[PDB]
Design an enzyme around this catalytic site. Structure first.
Site, PDB file in Angstrom:
ATOM      1  N   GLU A 130     -47.781 -20.729  -5.713  1.00  0.00           N
ATOM      2  CA  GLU A 130     -47.033 -22.026  -5.434  1.00  0.00           C
ATOM      3  C   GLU A 130     -47.510 -23.085  -5.823  1.00  0.00           C
ATOM      4  O   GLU A 130     -46.807 -24.088  -5.479  1.00  0.00           O
ATOM      5  CB  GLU A 130     -47.762 -22.157  -4.047  1.00  0.00           C
ATOM      6  CG  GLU A 130     -47.828 -19.964  -3.147  1.00  0.00           C
ATOM      7  CD  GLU A 130     -46.632 -19.792  -2.316  1.00  0.00           C
ATOM      8  OE1 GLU A 130     -45.907 -21.267  -2.508  1.00  0.00           O
ATOM      9  OE2 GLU A 130     -46.612 -19.502  -2.216  1.00  0.00           O
ATOM     10  N   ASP A 169     -40.518 -27.327  -0.107  1.00  0.00           N
ATOM     11  CA  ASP A 169     -39.741 -26.087  -0.328  1.00  0.00           C
ATOM     12  C   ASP A 169     -38.788 -25.943  -1.374  1.00  0.00           C
ATOM     13  O   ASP A 169     -37.897 -26.222  -0.239  1.00  0.00           O
ATOM     14  CB  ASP A 169     -40.695 -24.859  -0.229  1.00  0.00           C
ATOM     15  CG  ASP A 169     -40.262 -24.216   1.036  1.00  0.00           C
ATOM     16  OD1 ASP A 169     -39.283 -24.563   0.969  1.00  0.00           O
ATOM     17  OD2 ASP A 169     -40.723 -23.509   1.529  1.00  0.00           O
TER      18      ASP A 169
END
Length: 176
Positions: free
Chosen positions: A23, A32
């Protein structure tokens, strides 16, 4: 042949270090791979395209006026909360718990990672993969995971998790 140092590597890896690699760590709101506003260590703020909603959720999650920015300590506390939520989500679910229970410690980390990323219902809907994992059909489970939209829309975030399901080792996290 594994060196003394190599044999220590598995004790340095755990779910926190795993998700931290997948992540990343960002102290400011960003989008993202799917364009969703995110912060910290993979904390999805909202699916809204409205940055203002994301900042609102941020202040809610941290408990102060952040204006889109947090500290490392804050990222870590939120990350810890999210990991706990993913573990709790597995253990209370009648479909995921038996699979999780059957897995070894490293594949358990892959399971928590999968849930952290997709959420409980998304994961619990993967009927074939869950059966394959329970039956220790690791190659088949991995090939099937690699058909998913989760993996295919954002392969770099999911690829190590799939490898880990296949092997039950930490090799995909070595030598970044």
């Amino acid at each position: 042949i594994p060196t003394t140092e190599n044999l220590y590597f598995q004790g340095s890896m755990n779910i926190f270090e795993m998700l931290r690699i997948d992540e990343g760590l960002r102290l400011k709101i960003y989008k993202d791979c799917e364009g969703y506003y995110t912060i910290g260590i993979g904390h999805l703020l909202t699916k809204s395209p409205d940055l203002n909603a994301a900042k609102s959720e941020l202040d809610k999650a941290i408990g102060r006026n952040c204006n889109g920015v947090i500290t490392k300590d804050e990222a870590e506390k939120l990350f810890n909360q999210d990991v706990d939520a993913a573990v709790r989500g597995i253990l209370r679910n009648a479909k995921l718990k038996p699979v999780y229970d059957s897995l070894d410690a490293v594949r358990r980390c892959a399971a928590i990672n999968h849930v952290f990323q997709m959420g409980v219902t998304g994961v619990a809907g993967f009927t074939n993969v869950l059966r394959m994992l329970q039956q220790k059909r690791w190659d088949e489970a991995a090939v099937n995971l690699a058909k998913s939209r989760w993996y295919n829309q954002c392969p770099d975030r999911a690829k190590r998790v799939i490898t880990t399901f296949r092997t039950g080792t930490w090799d995909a996290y070595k030598n970044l």
